[PDB]
Symmetry: C3
């Protein structure tokens, strides 16, 4: 039960990370914050 | 207890899934650099 | 284990929240819904 959850979380951790970078970038190809 | 976390990880999975979709769509729509 | 996981889940909750917000604004700024 433990591993699965942690497995799960590092994966989620990976996605959100990539996501922030993508948004950051989309934030420039428009009007810089 | 873990059914909890396995629940709070379940909302995150769903959150990340929609967020990924939204970001892909915009990425497409925006377009430029 | 648990303080770590539970703390990792908060990191995640934090970021999903930020991201959602950023994405939401990004969609008003470009007219997309």
């Amino acid at each position: 039960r433990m591993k699965q959850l942690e497995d799960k979380v590092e994966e989620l951790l990976s996605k959100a990370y990539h996501l922030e970078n993508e948004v950051a970038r989309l934030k420039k190809l428009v009007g810089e914050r």
